[PDB]
């Protein structure tokens, strides 16, 4: 039997403890305080857990993947800090507290965000131990590609340039969700699998798996946005409706979105048949968590 609540509990604890050690208070104080305010506030740490679990699945250990795991959470964090700003979604709550720019000003929120992004690269490059240099370099490139113009940033810019697009298509919406959300999730699964010593074939199967849950994470985000309150979600919820935004609860409605999430999950766990079921248990569990979480 696999106790998923127990597993995530201790993986998240381990991750939160390393995030705190990696990003200490030091001069300039306000920049670092702002970095820690949003990073250590309190996310589910799905991305760093996926990175560690994929590393473990292929043979490696947590310690080798912890820096990359922390790095994906740093980049994920600054992407929410930047997403919340007035020129972007202009929100007032994130991770249960006022949004970064409300607490430090827009200037500091932008810069603190930029610091987390650069530091994620510094940190995986200099803190990773137990991997050949050529393997670290490779990981740095997968990370870079998963968050730039063919990844996270593209989905995010296409999202704000298609926020009034009344002529929405499944193809267009798929582009946004895959890039804006699935790309960083793929990257987290991929960095772990490569740092774990995985063979090309296992990496490719995990990339596909990650692609599914990646897309699934955004469908579920879109659904929560309309069925959960801001207090519950820890962030401003309900503004995706009032906006001409592109989501699934839009094109097919909540229910048809739910069924869709189910298939995605199903399809993701199917890619996992590549591995022995005892070993796949954690990723199978993270997959369900992504499907059935409440926030």
């Amino acid at each position: 039997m696999f106790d998923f609540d127990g597993y995530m509990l201790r993986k998240a604890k381990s991750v939160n403890k390393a995030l705190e050690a990696a990003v200490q208070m030091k001069e300039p104080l306000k920049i670092h305080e702002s970095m820690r305010y949003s990073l250590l506030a309190g996310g589910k740490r799905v991305r760093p857990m996926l990175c560690i679990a994929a590393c473990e699945l292929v043979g490696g250990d947590e310690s080798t993947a912890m820096p990359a795991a922390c790095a994906v959470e740093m980049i994920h964090t600054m992407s929410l800090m930047h997403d919340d700003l007035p020129c972007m979604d202009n929100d007032d709550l994130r991770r249960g507290k006022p949004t970064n720019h409300m607490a430090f000003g827009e200037s500091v929120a932008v810069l603190a965000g930029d610091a987390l992004l650069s530091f994620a690269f510094e940190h995986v490059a200099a803190a990773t131990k137990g991997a050949p240099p050529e393997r670290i370099v490779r990981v740095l490139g997968e990370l870079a590609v998963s968050i730039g113009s063919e990844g996270l940033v593209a989905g995010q810019v296409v999202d704000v340039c298609s926020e009034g697009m009344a002529e929405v298509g499944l193809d267009h919406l798929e582009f946004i969700h895959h890039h804006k959300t699935a790309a960083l999730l793929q990257g987290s699964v991929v960095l772990g699998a490569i740092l774990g010593g995985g063979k090309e074939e296992e990496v490719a199967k995990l990339r596909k798996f990650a692609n599914c849950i990646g897309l699934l994470f955004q469908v579920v985000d879109d659904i929560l946005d309309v069925t959960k309150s801001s207090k519950e979600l820890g962030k401003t919820a309900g503004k995706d409706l009032v906006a001409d935004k592109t989501t699934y609860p839009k094109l097919i409605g909540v229910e048809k979105s739910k069924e869709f999430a189910d298939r995605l999950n199903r399809e993701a766990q199917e890619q996992l048949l590549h591995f022995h079921p005892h070993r796949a248990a954690p990723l199978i569990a993270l997959a369900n968590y992504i499907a059935y979480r409440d926030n």
Binding site: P28, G105, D114, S118, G148, V157
Partner: protein, 259 residues
């Protein structure tokens, strides 16, 4: 601008144009391309190619690093001129022109920085042995210079400058953090990728540090008319000293950057 430096800069421009080709989604790659070339050219970048030559290696071994340096600098420039509603940053007179709105600029900046790391991780040529260890070292230098204790510290403190009553000492420190560290990073990386030894790397690092600071003071010279020739000579002197020990053709070239 001197012909040697202008020519090196042109090569970086070409290498960047070939690396970033506008394609779909144009909404993404258009601003990526435009904002890369919209940012000022930075010597931290040409200094990387030059530093590499000075110590022996060939410039093409440092091209990706030079492009990554310009890109990191470009995202920072875009973000520092970003229109902020809340008036969080003292409305600097600059008021530069903007082709895209704040959201597209912000995001594109966030996209430019990883592209720099992407080039670096990809310039990994099989027919190269010590490739991986040096590139990895260069990623560290670059991610550090563009990090919280590097350029960002300079951008943050710059907001405390009041054209009115703020010392030359404080302005020099901002230029050191905002420009000096990146320049130091560029000469160091060039040296590293060329194949130099720690002693040379530190000398070239230090030279970059002073030259970059001097350059920053020049740019801010046209703003806070107070820059006594003492500050500049000091920095100028400080730089050249670090080069004392490099002889040849490039030696006078590198020497010409500050002189």
């Amino acid at each position: 601008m001197q012909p040697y430096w202008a020519a090196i800069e042109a090569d970086i421009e070409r290498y960047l144009k070939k690396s970033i080709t506008i394609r779909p989604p144009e909404t993404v790659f258009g601003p990526m391309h435009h904002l890369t070339f919209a940012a000022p050219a930075t010597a931290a970048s040409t200094l990387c190619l030059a530093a590499c030559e000075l110590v022996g290696g060939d410039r093409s071994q440092a091209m990706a690093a030079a492009a990554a340096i310009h890109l990191v600098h470009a995202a920072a420039y875009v973000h520092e001129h970003l229109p902020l509603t809340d008036g969080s940053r003292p409305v600097s007179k600059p008021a530069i022109q903007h082709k895209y709105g704040p959201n597209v600029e912000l995001l594109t900046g966030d996209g430019i920085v990883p592209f720099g790391f992407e080039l670096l991780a990809g310039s990994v040529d099989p027919a190269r042995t010590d490739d991986p260890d040096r590139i990895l070292r260069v990623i560290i230098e670059i991610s550090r210079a563009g990090g919280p204790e590097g350029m960002i510290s300079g951008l943050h403190r710059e907001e405390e400058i009041v054209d009115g009553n703020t010392s030359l000492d404080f302005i020099e420190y901002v230029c050191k953090k905002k420009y000096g560290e990146m320049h130091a990073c560029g000469a160091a990386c060039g040296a590293i990728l060329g194949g130099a030894a720690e002693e040379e790397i530190q000398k070239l690092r230090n030279f970059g540090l002073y030259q970059g600071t001097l350059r920053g003071m020049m740019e801010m010279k046209n703003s806070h008319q107070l820059i006594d020739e003492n500050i500049i000579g000091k920095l100028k002197e400080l730089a050249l000293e670090e080069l004392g020990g490099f002889h040849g053709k490039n030696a006078e070239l590198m020497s010409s950057l500050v002189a």
